[PDB]
């Protein structure tokens, strides 16, 4: 037959794929293969759309067919790499990309896909070089440009930052106008100066990818319950998460399933990840009424069937657009009410989510247009943490008077009070109050342990541990799986912090910092002569960039001190050494905001307009420290400078945080669960009365 026939079907299918007509594309590809069975391009193109539909094994089969027909078919190798990467076979992906680039060194797409492996592997310098090769070969390449831009964000390379933001916004505008998937990921859109409409549109279009993967299942709509009779009057809530394990989300809410009222609620936890063997997974499996390992049910149709058979009334999406999500489960709507909660700081933009659980501080009603969901308000803040359960050894502290400071040499421990009963020369300072160990024999031995770098010592039968050696003493304590047994010593000397100056800290990933933020921090340090900035090597290759820009702003290098990433327990504990935390305005600290407040460290924040830029102020409002919340950059700076220069004020504010972390609702998981339950019932009564979702802002 004429070659134009199969060629025309293949090329028309390519167009249909571009337009989003995936089902039509599949038909045309398969008809092309009917007309011309040995059609390498059609095999590879078909496999591309099957990949997009989640039919990964069938895609692999057709990639291999294409390559059998054409051993040097570089397109097919690069496309196959993308499928192996999605299947988590990183080595196979690399072997495919390196083969494609060996066949065709000028293959722009293959260089950019290779770069995505280096980016995910933590090799940012090599990712950057490969993205730049891709853009050299194909100067108009939105995927490469935007992922390169995020590489540069990660390492705080701000070269031509203003022009980078221009082009990012231009790319998104063009892709949205042309009905294409934006090359900016929803979770990254918060970092760039895009309109709220663009951010919600980015999210909606990423959610539509889930539709392509469920439509091939041809499942009918689910019949949903309209009463609680089958559940004996109990409301069935299902928590869906890939992060039941050693993950920050468990560090936040692992207590909540077990605190639900069993008289009125039946709790189902659907894990999207296998059991990692940590106590976090043990606890949720033991305390939930039911625990379902969906990682054993990879078909989203069969997994949604399981949710529906359990009779779930409210299904809670804890992933949003993060690693491990299976939002296909929510697209299938196995429950009549589906809510976003906690794990993802932003809107799904998707029709299959009814609510986002938030609060009036985080998401004031006047910005409801930023969200596709209806707002459902928790009464104080929607954020929560398990710090009271995980880190009770930090509820009290004592210090050593090496001369009195509350944050130069710090001891914490469960048996710390019992220990101090034995030391007759301890002094009690009332700003609860703080015991002060004088510079005696015991104190000298503790300081000798730190200076000498010993792991622990024993005094009066009490184990005293070096705070830098927790993983050698008890790995489960370092991770937060268990409460440390010993008395732990934490000191500014351990981290190179000055003994006689103000320490401002921020322990966030460096990509949450932008030039405007560092300039603001620079203005503060210039106004507090005795002061340094304490930051984290995340990643370390960002350190020289921050240092270079800080010096361009008039800050010498010795004003910024970096520490490595620490295990969870040390990370929270060493926050006690700072005087003040400077929150990132672009995207706040979220978990890290809870962490510093639990240590008693005041956090200064300037809430923005996005959900992610307003969480810290929501936390401080619940805590009851409205004076740490700035309305603009001037106020942010003035607040931080006053804290660093008026030491009586600093003592007062730190005392407020230290006390109100306990007395306010911020860390009260029992009160949170109770209020969360009241919110679920408002949702259920609303649905049971035959109403579509509406704002629950009271």
């Amino acid at each position: 037959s004429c070659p134009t026939h199969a060629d025309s079907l293949n090329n028309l299918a390519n167009i249909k794929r571009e337009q989003g007509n995936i089902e039509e594309a599949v038909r045309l590809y398969r008809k092309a293969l009917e007309v011309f069975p040995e059609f390498a391009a059609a095999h590879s193109n078909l496999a591309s759309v099957l990949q997009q539909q989640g039919k990964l094994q069938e895609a692999l089969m057709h990639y291999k067919e294409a390559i059998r027909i054409s051993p040097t078919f570089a397109d097919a190798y690069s496309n196959m790499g993308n499928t192996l990467k999605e299947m988590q076979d990183v080595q196979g992906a690399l072997q495919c990309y390196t083969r494609a680039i060996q066949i065709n060194p000028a293959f722009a797409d293959a260089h950019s896909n290779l770069a995505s492996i280096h980016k995910d592997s933590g090799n940012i310098p090599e990712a950057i070089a490969s993205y730049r090769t891709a853009l050299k070969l194909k100067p108009d390449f939105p995927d490469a440009y935007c992922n390169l831009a995020h590489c540069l964000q990660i390492v705080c390379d701000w070269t031509d930052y203003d022009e980078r933001m221009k082009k990012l916004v231009s790319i998104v505008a063009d892709q949205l106008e042309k009905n294409r998937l934006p090359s900016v990921h929803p979770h990254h859109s918060m970092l760039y100066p895009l309109s709220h409409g663009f951010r919600k549109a980015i999210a909606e279009r990423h959610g539509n990818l889930c539709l392509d993967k469920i439509n091939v299942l041809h499942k009918p709509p689910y019949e949903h319950p309209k009463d609680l009779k089958l559940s004996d009057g109990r409301l069935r809530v299902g928590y869906v998460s890939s992060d039941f394990g050693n993950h920050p989300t468990s560090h936040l809410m692992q207590s909540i399933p077990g605190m639900h009222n069993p008289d009125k609620f039946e709790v189902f936890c659907y894990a999207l990840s296998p059991d990692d063997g940590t106590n976090f997974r043990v606890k949720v499996m033991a305390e939930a009424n039911h625990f379902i390992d969906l990682s054993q049910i990879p078909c989203n149709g069969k997994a949604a069937d399981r949710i529906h058979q359990d009779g779930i009334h409210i299904l809670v999406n804890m992933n949003g657009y993060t690693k491990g999500a299976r939002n296909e489960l929510f697209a299938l709507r196995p429950a009549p009410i589906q809510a976003m909660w906690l794990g993802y700081p932003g809107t799904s933009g998707a029709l299959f989510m009814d609510y986002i659980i938030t609060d009036q501080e985080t998401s004031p009603a006047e910005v409801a247009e930023q969200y596709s969901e209806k707002l459902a308000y928790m009464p104080h803040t929607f954020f929560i943490g398990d710090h009271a359960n995980m880190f009770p050894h930090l509820k009290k502290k004592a210090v050593i008077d090496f001369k009195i400071y509350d944050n130069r040499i710090v001891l914490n421990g469960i048996d710390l009070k019992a220990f101090l009963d034995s030391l007759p020369d301890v002094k009690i300072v009332k700003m609860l109050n703080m015991p002060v160990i004088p510079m005696n024999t015991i104190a000298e031995a503790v300081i000798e342990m730190i200076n000498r770098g010993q792991i622990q010592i024993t005094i009066n039968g009490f184990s005293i541990s070096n705070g830098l050696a927790t993983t050698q003493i008890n790995n489960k304590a370092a991770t937060g799986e268990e409460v440390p047994r010993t008395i732990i010593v934490t000191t500014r000397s351990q981290y190179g912090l000055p003994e006689d100056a103000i320490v401002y800290c921020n322990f966030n990933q460096l990509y949450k910092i932008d030039p405007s933020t560092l300039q603001m921090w620079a203005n503060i340090l210039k106004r507090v002569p005795n002061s340094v900035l304490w930051l984290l090597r995340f990643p370390a290759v960002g350190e020289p960039n921050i240092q270079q820009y800080a010096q361009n702003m008039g800050l010498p290098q010795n004003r910024i001190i970096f520490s490595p990433v620490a295990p969870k327990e040390e990370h929270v504990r060493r926050g006690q050494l700072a005087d003040v935390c400077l929150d990132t305005p672009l995207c706040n600290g979220h978990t890290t905001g809870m962490d510093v407040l639990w240590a008693g460290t005041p956090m200064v924040t300037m809430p923005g307009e996005t959900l992610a830029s307003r969480v810290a102020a929501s936390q401080l409002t619940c805590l009851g420290c409205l004076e740490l919340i700035a309305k603009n950059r001037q106020e942010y700076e003035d607040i931080a400078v006053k804290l660093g220069t008026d030491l009586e004020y600093l003592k007062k504010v730190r005392g407020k945080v230290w006390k109100q972390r306990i007395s306010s609702p911020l860390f009260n998981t029992k009160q949170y669960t109770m209020e969360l339950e009241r919110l679920y019932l408002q949702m259920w009564e609303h649905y049971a009365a035959g109403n579509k979702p509406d704002h629950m802002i009271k």
Binding site: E18, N82, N113
Partner: peptide
């Protein structure tokens, strides 16, 4: 962190 998206290549038949 999530996995970085990739770019599929559409092959034109000639």
């Amino acid at each position: 962190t999530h996995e970085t998206g990739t770019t599929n290549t559409a092959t034109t038949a000639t």
